[model samples]
Target: GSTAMATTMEQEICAHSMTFEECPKCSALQYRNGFYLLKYDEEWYPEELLTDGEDDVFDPDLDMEVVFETQ
Candidate 1:
């Protein structure tokens, strides 16, 4: 069911603290006002080829996967 947005809501629990939380459970912090850079393996190549290396010339539907191996 769809619900309308409300401007007013009750606030609870002021200045709470927690200790030793894991990565999966902890909330991620935003970088540079919510902007983040994505990096991939240098040796790994893209499955699809691009016409131009320019930002606007890249396709959004490019299929890329990250593969990692651990001992």
Candidate 2:
């Protein structure tokens, strides 16, 4: 008697039935909870704080800052 055993690696597929890299619903998790940098007046700031229209040098209304989205 002879028997052949077949083995294969399990692929990581998201709940959306697509690969994790190509899945829209799964890919957002990598960036959604990531860091968000704000470039205000050529300086970088963390997303933990918020700038109001009064205290900061740049007015939140009239002035706009560059937001750096990171993963």
Candidate 3:
């Protein structure tokens, strides 16, 4: 489930160019799915799940900031 959630998040990130602010709905949904995956999985599996949640944190009027950090 973790893998699934990760893959879904990766897809969302890819679709939106990693701009969390630009697609906060997707980000939040990904976050929720990720949490669900983490909470329910005993082993890693890959799949995509549906998310119907909306993001209240989204602010399109805000300026975007890109951060580069070392892993």
Q: Which of the numbered candidates is closest to the native, going by highest TM-score?
A: 2
Clashes of each: 0, 0, 0
Q: State candidate 1's TM-score.
A: 0.16
Q: In candidate 2, what are the lDDT values of residues 1-71, reduced to their tens digit?
A: 23423432245455533455556644343332343333332212222133344234344434443333232
Model 1 weakest 10-residue run by lDDT: 12-21
Q: What lDDT would each prediction earn against the true structure? A: 0.27, 0.37, 0.34
TM-score of each: 0.16, 0.19, 0.16
Tens-digit lDDT track of model 1 for 5-46: 453223321222112322232232221122222223222122
Per-residue lDDT for 64 in model 1? Answer: 41
Q: Work out candidate 2's RMSD over C-alphas.
A: 12.5
Please provide, for model 3 over 1-71, each residue's C-alpha lDDT reduced to its tens digit, 9 standing for 90 to 100. 45753345433343522443446554433544543322232222212334212321232333223311111
Residue pairs whose backbone atoms clash in candidate 3: none
The ten-residue window of minimal lDDT in model 3 covers 62-71
Please tell me which model should have the higher TM-score, number 1 or number 2: 2
Q: Model 3 — TM-score against the truth?
A: 0.16
| Model 3 bad stretches (over 4 Å) | 1-17, 27-46, 51-71
Question: Where does candidate 2 clash, by residue pair?
Answer: none
